[PDB]
Design a protein around this ligand. Structure first.
Ligand code: ODE
Ligand code: ODE
Lengths: 10, 228, 232, 10
């Protein structure tokens, strides 16, 4: 659930 | 490999197209008020750095855990190289944001900071000395993203090679002699080692700041710092 | 001035080959504690440092600099120089670091000391890289001397940059001689200089752990305390 | 007089 995953994924 | 079959000319344009925007400080001074502005700023820049990184040729090929590693490795180096770039045509000053231009002795606010300040000003001066071009800069910035975390793991190296080819073609195009080409390339790669050093010092004073409870760090920033 | 900046690329390689310090042996015996291992590394390093000082003086151009600049460059560069040296001699011992001919550490002896393993791997990664490119003795010594000249140059000017351009020409002379095409010469130089950043990174890390070790508390040599107190 | 000083002088 790390923010960095999220922001890259788009 | 789409990024492997680009001309130097179309490589430079992608990097140029993908440059992140310049952000403003939320500025309206203390050790705490300084680190707040800087933290708030960094935190918003990181979000765009991620976008930019995604637009860097070859980067989008790598796996996700790979891209993650590269970013959590490179991030402050990337912010600092952007800072020195922005700061070039302000001798003796650092331009964090169009509305946030510091001079050295606003540094003394934050033990840790004048030391790095001076490292960044010397680099700024160096880039000005050699008269860095925007095209060389976007290359520099991509090497940093691709190299900085590469060994703490072939395609990456293929990409770094193209980036080197690009760098050299721009120098040839600027009229540099073959001898000048490799001396310039070299003294620019040599600056990366200074940026890394500067990032290692910054990472560390940042961590002492988090520990002394000077300001709250954002969740993204905790994750980044934690990585180091 | 002169006089360095008037050497042929071939006699620059030779000056540097001639100045190369010897590989020093360890005092090593006796099972390993964190204490035993760290007193070994500090004994070896202390002795390596003395050779490094003398070696620096043989780096063409170094001795033209002012003593205080000599001190600064060496104070910045010292643990990079030892690392690059370790990496280079560990080159034919995959997975293993050759501290000395009689002190070869494997991954898991690293763990005796706190956060030594992480550095261990970083050096291993670098060693692997040198191997995968087949770094050459002659390239190595240019690199070793770039480190010395570069590490503390932007934390101070133009004499250092002339010498550096000389070392680059030298590096390129080498690759032109090995019969590399121009494009692969420029690529190789790039690959070699990017490694320098990893060396800075590792030095920076080893440095902070050395600092925390001095608190933890093996006694360090006087020369070593001084070299370390320069980064605090 | 750092110990480094002496070594570099001699
Ligand atoms: C004189 C250099 O000034 C700094 O702020 C550096 C570091 C620092 O000084 O931190 C403590 C001495 C740090 O790394 C730099 C920095 C920073 C912040 C924003 C930015 O666009 C570029 C760099 C930093 C920064 C500051 C706050 C954060 O939350 C994240 C990064
Ligand atoms: C596998 C990593 O191996 C090490 O010892 C690194 C560091 C370490 O392990 O943790 C403490 C920093 C350290 O920096 C390295 C190192 C060292 C020691 C001797 C040498 O010839 C080359 C490097 C080191 C070293 C150790 C004691 C000294 O007095 C000086 C350097």
């Amino acid at each position: 659930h790390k923010i960095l995953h999220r922001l890259l994924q788009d | 490999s789409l990024a492997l079959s680009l001309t130097a000319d179309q490589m430079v344009s992608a990097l140029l197209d993908a440059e992140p925007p310049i952000l403003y400080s939320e500025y309206d001074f203390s050790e705490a008020s300084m680190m707040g502005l800087l933290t708030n700023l960094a935190d918003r820049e990181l979000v765009h750095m991620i976008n930019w990184a995604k637009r860097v040729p070859g980067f989008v090929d790598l796996t996700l855990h790979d891209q993650v590693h590269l970013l959590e490795c490179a991030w402050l180096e990337i912010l600092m190289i952007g800072l020195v770039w922005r700061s070039m045509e302000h001798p003796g000053k650092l331009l964090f944001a169009p509305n946030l231009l510091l001079d050295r002795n606003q540094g003394k606010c934050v033990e840790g900071m004048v030391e790095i300040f001076d490292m960044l000003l010397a680099t700024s001066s160096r880039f000005r000395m050699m008269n860095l071009q925007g095209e060389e800069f976007v290359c520099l910035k991509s090497i940093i993203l691709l190299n900085s975390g590469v060994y703490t793991f072939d395609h990456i190296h293929r990409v770094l090679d193209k980036i080197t080819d690009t760098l050299i073609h721009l120098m040839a195009k600027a009229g540099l002699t073959l001898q000048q080409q490799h001396q310039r390339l070299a003294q620019l790669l040599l600056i990366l080692s200074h940026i890394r050093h500067m990032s290692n010092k910054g990472m560390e004073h940042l961590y002492s700041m988090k520990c002394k409870n000077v300001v709250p760090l954002s969740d993204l920033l905790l994750e980044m710092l934690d990585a180091h």
